[PDB]
Design goal:
By secondary structure, this protein is an all-alpha fold. It has one domain. The chain has 4 helices and no strands. The longest helix is centred in the N-terminal third of the chain and has 14 residues. The structure holds calcium ion (2 copies). Belongs to the calmodulin family. This is Calmodulin-1. Its main location: cytoplasm. Keywords: Acetylation, Calcium, Cell projection, Cilium, Cytoplasm, Cytoskeleton, Disease variant, Flagellum, Host-virus interaction, Isopeptide bond, Long QT syndrome, Metal-binding, Methylation, Phosphoprotein, Repeat, Ubl conjugation. It is found in: Cytoplasm, Cytoskeleton, Spindle; Cytoplasm, Cytoskeleton, Spindle pole; Cytoplasm, Cytoskeleton, Microtubule organizing center, Centrosome; Cell projection, Cilium, Flagellum.
Amino acid sequence: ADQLTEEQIAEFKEAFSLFDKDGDGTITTKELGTVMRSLGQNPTEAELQDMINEVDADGNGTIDFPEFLTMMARKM
Ligand SMILES: [Ca+2]
Ligand SMILES: [Ca+2]
């Protein structure tokens, strides 16, 4: 288990699906709203822009699964 057991990791994969509902391979900022919100939270518009950028490794302005996982490492 790197991050966590295959369970938690697997769920992170599922969470990814929940994020990228379109399956475009790209979590958008607006989608981030949905994302954080879906986990049962309430982000501000700023939080969408900022939450992405804070965990954007490429500086592109989008989040993928790999980046999500690194973010997940921060989630602790
Ligand atoms: Ca998307
Ligand atoms: Ca990115």
